[PDB]
Amino acid sequence: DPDTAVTNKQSFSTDVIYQVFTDRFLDGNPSNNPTGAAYDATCSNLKLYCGGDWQGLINKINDNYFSDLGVTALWISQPVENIFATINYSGVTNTAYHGYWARDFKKTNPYFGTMADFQNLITTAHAKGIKIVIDFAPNHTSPAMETDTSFAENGRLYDNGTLVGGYTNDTNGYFHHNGGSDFSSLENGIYKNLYDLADFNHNNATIDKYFKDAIKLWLDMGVDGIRVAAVKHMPLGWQKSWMSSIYAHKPVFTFGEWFLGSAASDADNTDFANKSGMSLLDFRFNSAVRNVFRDNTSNMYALDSMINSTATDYNQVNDQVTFIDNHDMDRFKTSAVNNRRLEQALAFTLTSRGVPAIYYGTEQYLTGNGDPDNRAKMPSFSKSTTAFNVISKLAPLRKSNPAIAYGSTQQRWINNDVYVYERKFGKSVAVVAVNRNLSTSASITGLSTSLPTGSYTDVLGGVLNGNNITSTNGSINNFTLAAGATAVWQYTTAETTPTIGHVGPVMGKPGNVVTIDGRGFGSTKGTVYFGTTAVTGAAITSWEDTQIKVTIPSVAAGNYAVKVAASGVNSNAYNNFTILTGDQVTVRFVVNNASTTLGQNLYLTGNVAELGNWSTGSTAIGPAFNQVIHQYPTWYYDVSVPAGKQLEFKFFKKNGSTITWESGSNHTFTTPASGTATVTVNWQ
């Protein structure tokens, strides 16, 4: 199938995700609405259920609302059965409308519909090329007071009808009982209750196994992408393991939510995105967008920097999901913020790198500062807004022009209020000029692009005051960029040499199937490369110009670079493909008597890639924790590592470049062939 097809569950770079709070869109079925004080017909009260369900989405899918808007994927709230109880938080009754307070991940939220309904939604969506992405928060259950069982549903977790256990009298240790996260450390956040949310203990095998089984179900059903919530509050090791489990079943595009409140880098966030096997929601791109266009707190340079700084940190910057607003913040539009700016931030998002998402209601210029005001009911389904217009023109570009989909970004012109940047992938190009100034226009002179000689038209038709240019070998001729103007000029052509635009997913073990997207691969099956290893014949499950489905060859676990060769002509390399050793399990390492100096730390490293193949580098595990689950001088760390394999490992303290290893013999362990396990040792 072409890389653009809805069939491509491994890549959403060519897509436009429409993020929707199911309950707040369209109540297609009233029969499934909550009874009593959990329900609000007018939806005037947002802490309540308004009625929204899957039929309603089915509906807007059939009358082409989404197809006229050009969004190629729907991101809906978590489908799993939530707590039925109502919770008043000091005078105010709250409901699980958001879908965050789960109790059973193997049943569907009846207020959203049935299993048939869901399967009925998955069908209608693919029928029209709309992918379905869902939320899945494996971090916790519902709010739970341990002293008090009469509060909510005491976080009780079921398993397709059968109850596993609640927060109180949790003899087996499913949840964590460390109190709440005061948010001072990464550890404090991971291992402790988020607010009052019942924290799971993924080290517990039944919980480990449960989630593997649960996601497997939803994937088996048709989901194309999964959005993991609260990833900053669950161990990386456990998630990376959860991931390898998913990629072994039906590899789908997964991303997570690690909150950042600025365009500024955060190692932890970078690291995560890079070592977890999943991507993130580009909160730095979002901030950049907003200071510039919404808040007027930064200028175009700040935007250009964020563009570059992010490309350096993230390994696959194209997988980071972008946005202008979302359920975690004030609606972009406000009385002080004007439309052209909203439309400008859209145009920017829609044409920039990564996977873009649009919070439902944006096209309608919905406003609503804070929670749940940023979760207001869907106000209209008109296709007349200027916002609506801009999306329909700019979104299909992601499917038609691969410079948008997989291309690099480089600035041709810039100044405080003006920005002209260029996307390019192979021979294809796209140029976007932006002028945020609402009162003055700009005389752009000397602009150079890589647009072949021609007379170039504004893809937007001047809706956003775009003009027409003329290129003379890159050389664009002196032109005015009107006030609040924005124009998009592109250039597509056929690719002749193979050129990789994507590899999906980018981590797995030998035996898995990965998707290579690009252009020019040709039709006659060629050969793939994982480093120096040539994959050929029946290993290449599929082959065609824009996509190749290949099998991860049985090579040595490590970081590799994928190269493809269509007619002897090798393409470029998609660096950083992580090849595992095989199936993963999660092992909690505990070392005692590890006394560090001020500013010193402990890392893990062993004889397998998962542990860094004896390195003290970035590839080593750590720094280890020492506060919640175990305290200093006892350190601990959960790590994803090959199952049923004899491991050798040794701890080491680093404090400068100066490393200090454990003495004596390497510690050994034979990992479980499945699930999770603990392994305690003493600092030698």
Ligand SMILES: [Ca+2]
């Ligand atoms: Ca309903």
Ligand SMILES: [Ca+2]
């Ligand atoms: Ca947690």
